[model samples]
Target chain A: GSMSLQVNLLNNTFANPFMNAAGVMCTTTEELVAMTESASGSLVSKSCTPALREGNPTPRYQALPLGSINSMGLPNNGFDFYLAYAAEQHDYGKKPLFLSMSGLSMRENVEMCKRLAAVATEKGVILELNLSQVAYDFDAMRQCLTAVSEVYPHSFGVKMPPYFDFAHFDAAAEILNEFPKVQFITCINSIGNGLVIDAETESVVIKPKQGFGGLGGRYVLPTALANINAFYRRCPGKLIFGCGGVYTGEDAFLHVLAGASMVQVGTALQEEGPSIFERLTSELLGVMAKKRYQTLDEFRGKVRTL
Target chain B: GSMSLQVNLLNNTFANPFMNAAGVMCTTTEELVAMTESASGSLVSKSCTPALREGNPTPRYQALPLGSINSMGLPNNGFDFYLAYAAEQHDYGKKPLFLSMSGLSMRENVEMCKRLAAVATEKGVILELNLSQVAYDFDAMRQCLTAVSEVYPHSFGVKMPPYFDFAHFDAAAEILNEFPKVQFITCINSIGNGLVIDAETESVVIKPKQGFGGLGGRYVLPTALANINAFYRRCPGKLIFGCGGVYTGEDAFLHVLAGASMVQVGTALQEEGPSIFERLTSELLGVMAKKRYQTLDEFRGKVRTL
Candidate 1:
C-alpha cells in the first residue's frame, strides 16, 4: 500500500495530521509525554495561565452518547511549569510541540505574552489564542483595539468559534488577513453555552455557569465542517486546523476534505483516552486506501460544492 | 401495554407527540391530507406567504447520511390555499391541525391574521406562526408590535431557533412570558447557515444561497434538547413544541425528557416521508414500555442534573 498520512505545517513535516485537542490529553507533563510517545503526529499543551490553579467545581465534565459538555474554567499547570517541561526535557524530534495559552485577565495575558514572546524565540515553541470560552468579553474589545502582532511578536494562529453566517466568516477572515502574523486558523473550538441535564434530579449537569457549558462531538460536525470550509475558502494566506465531532477515520476524512491541514480530537479523546490516536490513524489509512488516495494531497481541501 | 401516548395541546388531545416538521410534509393539499391520515398526533401546514412561491434554485434540498440541508426560501402555496383546504375540507376528529405561516411581507401576515381571526372563531381553527424560517426582526416585531390576540383572537404559539446562551434564552422567554397569548414555544427550526459540499467537484451540494442552508436531523439533537430544556426551564408559562434532530423513538424520548410536549421531524421526514409517523409512534411506545412509564407525565420534563 502506497498510502501516506504526512502533513506539512510551518516549515516542518508531521507524521500525520491528527492530534488531541489541547484541553484533552496535554494537561500535565505526564500526559504531554504520553502523547509524544503515541501514534499522534503532534501534541499541544493545555492552555495555561500565569499561576497554578484548580479548575471548576465537581463534575465539571459529563460525557453523553452523542457528545460531551464541560465548564472546566481553564484548569491547568501554570505557564512556568509547562514552559519548564517543554524547554528542559521536551525532544521535538519525535513530534512537534505547541503551547496553548488562555489568561483569565487581559493584563495577565499581555504580561505573559511579553515574557513568552521574549523566551519563545530562544526555546523554539509556538503559541495560539482564541475567543470562545477562553476570552469571550475581551475578544470583542481586543479584536477592535489591541495591537495583536506587536503584543505577541510572533507569527502564530488561533482556535476559533464556528461562524454560521458567510458575512461573519468574511468579516473575521478580513480582520485576520489584515494581521499577516495570523498564520493559521483552527476553525472551531466548541459551540459554547450548551446545557445538559440529569434525568433523575431535573437539575443542570455541570456546576459552573449554572450548568451551561461548551458543546462538542456529533452535535457540531456540520457546523464544524461549515467553518472549516468557510475559512479554507475565505482565508487564503492561513492554514486551517479542524476540530470537533471527529471520532472516526470517516470524520477525519471529512475534515481533510473540508480543508483542514490538521485535525484535533476533543470529546472523543475524553471518552476514549490516548489510545484513540492509534485507532484513528489506522482507520484514516484504511479510508484513504479505499478512496484510492495515495496521499492526503490527493483529496485534502477538495470538497466539491455543486 | 398500559402506557398512554396521549398528549394534550390547548383544547385538543393528540394520540402522540410525533409529527412532521413544517415545510417538510405540508407543501400541498395532497401532502397535508396524507399527513392527516398518518399516525401523527398533529400536523402543521407549510409556512405560507402572500402568494405562491416556487422556492429557490435547483438542488435546493439535499439529504446526507447524518442529516440534510435546504434553502427552499419559503416556497409554498399562498395562505388562501391552506385556509381553504383546512376550513372547507378539514375534519378534525382523531388529531388536530395547525397552520404555519411565514409572511413574505409584514402586511401579508397582518392581513392573514385579521382574516384568520375573523373565521377561526366559528370554524374552530388554530394558527401557529414563526416555526419554519423567518427574519429575526420580523419575528420579534410580530411578537411585540402586532396586536397578536386582536388580529388572531386565539392563543397560539411559535417555532423557534435554538438559543445557545442562557442570556438569549432568558431574554426571549422574558418577552414571550409577557404575552400569555403566545401559548407554545417550539424549541427550534434548524441550525441555519450550514454549507454542504461534494468531494469530487469542489462545489456546494445545494444550489440556493450559494449552497448555504439550514441544517437538520441528528446533527442537532443535543442543541435541540438543550434549547427545549432551556425554554422549558425559563418559559414556565408556555409549553414547548420540540423540533429538530428527532428521527427515532429514542430521539423522541429524549425530547420528552427535555420537556417537549410535542416532537416534530425535519430531515427524517423529508427522507422517510409521512410513513415515518407510524414508525416513530411504534418506537416511542416501545421505549415507554421498556422504561415502564405508563404515561408521558412521569418522564416528560424530568431531565436530572447531577
Candidate 2:
C-alpha cells in the first residue's frame, strides 16, 4: 500500500494523450476490450506470429514463496486465425486497438508487417511493431523501424528489450543526440529469463532449461530501477516503458523515482495473475496521496542523487 | 485479504488414516515432487477425472468483476499417468498436498474404486470422489459407497454437491449411514449451472458445455450448510469435509459448525489464486486465537443452541 507511482499518459505537454508518444499495446483479447473500454487511446493485440506456436509445456508453473515461473511461449494459435477475423475484431467507434506482430524470419516479418500496414485503417487503427529478438546494430534497427513505419502510415512504434548499459548507452546517446530524431523505447526485458526450479524433481521448472533458471521476483526491483535511471539519463526524449518484476505498491514507487515514464509489468502479470492491474491502479493512487504528488510529471525521474 | 477461508491442516485423526491408506498403496509419486514443494498440507490439487482428459481450450478464461470463469474441464493427463509414476511424480514431498478425483460412468467409477482402494498409500492422498450427479437413490448410493470400500478395502471418502433441502440429501446420507466405514465426507456442491460470456464477443468464456454444468461461488455456501446440517443430524460419524461458499474465515467456521471435520475450497482459489490459502489459514487461525481455540476440538463444531 505504501508503494505506488503516478505515471501520466500525456505527452511532453502534460495534456493526457491516449495516443501520445507513449508505447501502447494489449496482449490478450480480454485485455483489448478492457483497455478499449477504459478509453485507452492505443491498443495492441497479442503478438501475432507467421506460424502457429504450441507455446510451452503444461503444469507451466510451480509456485514459490515469492512467486512462480510460467513459460507460455507465446502459445498463440496462428496468424491466419486472427487475420481472418480482423474485420470483426475492433470497435470502430472507439480508439483503435493496434496489432503487434512477432516475426521468426525476415520474410515472415516483411509479409505480416506489410499486410497489417495495408489492411489497418488510416485513423481507426495503428500498428506497433514488436521486434521480439534481434542481434543487430543501429543500421539494422533503423532499417526495421523505417521499413514498418513506411508501410504502416499511422503512428507506429518499436519495442525492444533493454540491453545498453550506461557505458554502452553513452555512444548511442551521442549519435541519437546528433540526429535528434525521436522514437519509442521500452527498457528491461524479461532478461534472458527469470528461472524457477522444482528442488525435489531436480528438474528445471521454467522454460527451455534444467535445474538452474533465470532470476526474477523482488530481485528485479533494483535492476528495473537501475535501467529506468539509465534510459532517463541518456535517451531523455524517447517514450520509455520500464518493466521486469514489478509486483507490490512499493516497487512501483521505486520505478517512478528511478525515472520510469510508465511501467509495464511482464512477470508481475504472470505471478499475480489477472487481478494485478486493478490492485496496482488502486495501490498506486493511494501511494500518490501519501506523497502529495498531484501529477505524474511532478515527481517522475527525480532520483539522480539518491 | 477479505475474501479467504483458512483451512487448518493441523494433525487431526482424519488426516492420519487417509495418509496411511495412501502410503500403503504408494500412489504419491515423484513427478509432483519438484512442482508442489511449496504447497501446504491443506493444498488441494486440480481435480482428477476418472478417465484421462485433454482438458479445455487454452486461454480458457474470462475475467469477471469480482472473480473469473475458467473452463479447465478437469483435463487430467489420466490415472495411468499418475499410476505409472505416482512415486516419481511425487518423490519430492515437502507438504502433503491433497488430490481430488472425478467420475464419469458407474463402471469406470467402480474400476477406479477398486484400483485406488488397492493402493493403500493413496489413501493418504485423501481421495475425494466427486458425487456431483449421482441420482438420489438409496440402492444406487449404497452401491457406489460399497464399491469404494469393496474396491479399496480401506477407509475412504466422497464429496457431494449442494442439496437444496432435506430431500436432496436423503439418498446421500442413506448410503453414508449404510457404509459407516469411510474415513471422511464433504458436501453441498455448487449445484446450479453458471457461465460467463465476453460482452463484446458474447461467447462463453469458461469451460465449454458437455451439456452438464454446475453452480459454484457465493451462490453455493448457504445451500451447502443446509445439507451438511441435515447430514450431521442423520449420520453424525460421517467425518465431514465441509465446503461451499467458503472464501473467508467466517464461512469456514460456519461449515465446521454445520458438522464438517474438514473443509475444501473451489471458488476462492479462482478468486485470489493460491494466496487465498495463506490468507484463509491466517484468518482461521486468528479467529481461533481470539476464541482461545487451543485445539481444533475445543471449538470445532461447538455451536450450542438454547
The sequence of per-residue lDDT tens digits that candidate 1 reaches over residues A202-259 is 5667888767788888778778888888888889888988888889988888888888
Worst ten-residue run, lDDT, model 1 chain A?
A133-142
Docking class of 2: incorrect
Clashes counted in candidate 1 amount to: 14
Query: Per-residue lDDT tens digits of candidate 1, residues B222-260?
Result: 778888988888887888988988888878888898889
Highest-scoring model, lDDT: 1
> Candidate 2 overall Cα lDDT vs. reference?
0.49
Index of the highest-DockQ prediction: 1
* Model 1 misplaced stretches (Cα beyond 4 Å): A1-4, A133-150, A193-212, A289-295, B1-3, B105-108, B131-150, B197-204
lDDT by residue (tens digit), candidate 2, A1-306: 233233333222211112211112244456556555552233446666777777655645444544334444565645654454344666646544445566666556677766665565533344445653352244555556555555555445444443323333454444434332224444554333332322123234544422122234443443445456556667776655555556754455556655665555555555554456567656656666766666656556665230
Name the lDDT value of residue B226 in candidate 1.
81
For candidate 1 chain B, the 10 contiguous residues with the lowest summed lDDT are B131-140
